[PDB]
Amino acid sequence: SLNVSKLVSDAKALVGTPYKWGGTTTSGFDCSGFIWYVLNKQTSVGRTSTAGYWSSMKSIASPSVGDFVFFTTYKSGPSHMGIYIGNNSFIHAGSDGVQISSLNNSYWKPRYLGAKRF
């Protein structure tokens, strides 16, 4: 339903932007806002938590590029998310900033909860 070429490229350009709670701006993001910021560039969408995007998104088993991947970090259930960019990588917005991280890292992979797609 979206130009994955635009999503992944529109996200990638933002690498290096720092972290802030509820950050919907180019001056700081979080899990939810980074996806919100990147998504509203193409279509109008509402702002929700990582838990909301988990429950408002359509279920799939294996991510394709442009799909959304979910992890359990600070609490039980979805608490962190990113976009699948290909290979086994994902772009996400974290404390140190927007980063590219791969799904075969020792922190993420045990905590990879599943994938849900727009």
Partner: protein, 153 residues
């Protein structure tokens, strides 16, 4: 007159308050009730704070122990708090525990009069390159407190 071991205890203290403040609830207060409802303001989706943090005054009372008075002004501004139907509200957001503050290291950057600043190198659970977080401590009343809201996380 503030040591490294003590500073981490305060910094880890602000970490606790910041998270709970942003979540809308002090988890210790189990008698609380969190108002259902979302709204939009300033192009932000807002949610209601739990009873224990329901009013700005309750919020201010929560944090004046660890954060200087000025840190609380700027914080209420920076994180765009608002009041609707008499209840305080926050823009919805998520946290990140990527930084392992418990296993941090502190190096003193400055001590000039009433102000002290320490540089923390924080390991990442991620395996990610570890993070430089400078925290400034200022003594309000006689208590050492942090002079910015979002200093830890």
């Amino acid at each position: 007159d503030l040591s490294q071991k003590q500073a981490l205890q305060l910094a880890l203290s602000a970490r606790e308050h910041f998270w709970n403040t942003m979540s809308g609830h002090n988890p210790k207060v189990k008698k609380a009730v969190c108002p259902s409802g979302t709204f939009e303001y300033q192009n932000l989706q807002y949610v209601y704070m739990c009873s224990d943090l329901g009013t700005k005054a309750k919020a201010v009372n929560y944090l004046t122990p660890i954060f200087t008075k000025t840190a609380i002004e700027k914080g209420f501004k920076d994180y765009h708090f608002t009041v609707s139907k008499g209840k305080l509200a926050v823009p919805i957001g998520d946290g990140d525990n990527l930084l392992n503050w418990k296993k941090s290291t502190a190096k003193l950057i400055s001590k000039k009069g009433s102000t002290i600043t320490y540089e923390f190198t924080v390991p990442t659970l991620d395996g990610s390159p570890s993070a430089k977080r400078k925290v400034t401590f200022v003594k309000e009343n006689k208590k050492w407190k942090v002079n910015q809201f979002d200093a830890v996380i």
